[PDB]
């Protein structure tokens, strides 16, 4: 993997950042929206702050031409892209040529490096590293921060959270440079690796829900149906209302044995069975039973804050801000409540939908928020197109369409035709935004679209 050649780039980028900090410049950080990007941004923000420097961090959905235009118009001395940028080397080199830029990323890059000086690409991939298992974005951010200052090793766990968010340990164990990071954590006592049930929900979920929506691996005849999960858990002598962390080690072992027996007996694939028990990263820095205590659960929290346009709040959580954790809990709870109320509203008012030859259309008005549209449609299925007035715009309606394989049996491709109708109505086209005064015109154009 030629680690020395990668470390050369790492040291270069780190040195650049430190140089600009010592010059008193504002380090302009830009990172991605998921757990990997949020943890990366946190790591770099702490790296800058620890040197007594000044940063400005933005958590974005993706690097776009418009975003690069905005950043360019900002006229900074230095831009650092985290978990982003590799697919946009020329763009960044084109519009940010006037400034120092560092790209710390792990996605397969458009080029091997930048062509001009003062622009450094810190990416393990051009050195032979596997993008999806050797290091995540937060991982390379961690390497850079560590080269900046060894103290930043105290962010190891944070990095690993990102790593788990990026599913770098999809096969039940860590690989490549990730391992290094893990060791750092181990040396500090800020993380530990357990051989346990790799499923989501060991900290905050009842056993029955931990089994119910288990993916990677999936549990045959248990995944999906919570009732069967409850029955199965009561049968094997477990408290289905109990949480995994509350189990003793022997009880955990018995759970593993029982689940493995079940999956073998119901013809689960060997890979899935081999992925049931494996590495699970824990941190003594947080109380057991807390979502931050385990990497996957922490990553789940962060992703959740990311989707609700509060990625920076998640960053603050990674930085050790308890207040931000509180606010985030409140926010997620309120969101959940909104979801419940949306389900209740749409089920109670299913008498307002429009009967189509190819689709259903439910206009909720202002009663269901934009973001809740899609999940509303699904909730109308598990009990289809939903529309709602946009909160941002005023003359705009945002809508989402959901469907199953039974529809795919005869094409019925939603995203295909939705693009057509959105094109006809003068809107973007999956989900669709279009003029509120053309809803009727949408409906007719959607039945014919399929």
């Amino acid at each position: 993997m030629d680690k020395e050649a990668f470390l050369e780039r790492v040291r270069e980028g780190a040195e650049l950042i430190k140089m600009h900090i010592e010059l008193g410049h504002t380090i302009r950080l830009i990172s991605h929206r998921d757990a990997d990007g949020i943890t990366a941004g946190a790591i770099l923000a702490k790296a800058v702050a620890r040197e007594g420097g000044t940063f400005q961090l933005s958590i974005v959905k993706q690097v776009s031409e418009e975003l690069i235009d905005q950043l360019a118009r900002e006229k900074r001395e230095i831009y650092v892209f985290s978990d982003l940028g590799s697919g946009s080397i020329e763009l960044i080199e084109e519009k940010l040529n006037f400034a120092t830029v560092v790209v710390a990323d792990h996605h397969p890059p458009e080029k091997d490096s930048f062509s001009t000086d003062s622009h450094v690409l810190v990416n393990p991939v051009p050195f032979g590293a596997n993008s999806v298992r050797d290091l995540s974005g937060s991982g390379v951010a961690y390497f850079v921060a560590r080269e900046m200052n060894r103290k930043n090793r105290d962010m190891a766990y944070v990095a690993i959270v990102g790593a788990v968010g990026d599913m770098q340990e999809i096969d039940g164990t860590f690989h490549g440079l990730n391992l290094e990071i893990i060791e750092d954590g181990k040396e500090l006592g800020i993380l530990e690796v357990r051989k346990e049930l790799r499923l989501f929900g060991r900290e905050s979920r009842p056993l029955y829900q931990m089994l119910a929506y288990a993916t990677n691996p999936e549990i045959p005849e248990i995944t999906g149906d919570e009732r069967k999960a409850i029955e199965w858990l009561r049968a094997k002598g477990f408290d289905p209302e109990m949480k995994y962390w509350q189990l003793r080690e022997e009880e955990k072992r018995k759970l593993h044995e029982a689940l493995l027996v079940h999956m073998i007996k119901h013809g689960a694939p060997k890979e899935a069975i081999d992925r049931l028990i494996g590495d699970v990263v824990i941190s003594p820095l947080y109380p057991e039973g807390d979502v931050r205590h385990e990497a996957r659960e922490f990553a789940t929290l962060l992703n959740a804050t990311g989707r609700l346009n509060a990625g920076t709040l998640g960053v603050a959580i990674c930085l050790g801000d308890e207040e931000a954790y509180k606010v985030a809990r409140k926010m997620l709870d309120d969101y959940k409540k909104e979801q419940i109320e949306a389900r209740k509203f749409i089920i109670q008012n299913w008498n307002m939908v429009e009967e189509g030859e190819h689709a259903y259309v439910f206009y909720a008005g202002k009663n269901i928020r934009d973001t809740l549209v899609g999940i509303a449609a699904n909730m109308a299925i598990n009990a289809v197109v939903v529309l709602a007035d946009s909160d941002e715009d005023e003359n705009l309606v945002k809508g989402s369409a959901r469907t199953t394989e039974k529809a795919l049996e005869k094409g019925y491709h939603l995203g295909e035709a939705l693009k057509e109708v959105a094109e006809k109505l003068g809107g973007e086209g999956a989900g669709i935004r279009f003029p509120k005064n053309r809803i009727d015109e949408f409906i007719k154009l959607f039945n014919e679209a399929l």
């Binding site: 008193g24 702050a49 933005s58 900002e74 207040e323």
Partner: protein, 56 residues
């Protein structure tokens, strides 16, 4: 030196000169930034910013 803290900015904000003769901003809504406390605190009381604690 000028006292500064870390904040989450709630709304879009144009660039602003600080007591250290350095430019802070412009800010996109939701940006996290280290800015001089005199400005940050006023932004917080105006409810345009939130303090965030970075434990070092």
């Amino acid at each position: 030196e000028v006292p500064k803290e870390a904040y989450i900015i709630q709304i879009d904000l144009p660039a602003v000169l600080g007591p250290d003769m350095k430019e802070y901003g412009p800010f996109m809504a939701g940006d996290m930034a280290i800015i001089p406390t005199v400005i940050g605190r006023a932004l917080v009381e105006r409810e345009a910013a939130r303090r965030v604690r970075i434990f070092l």
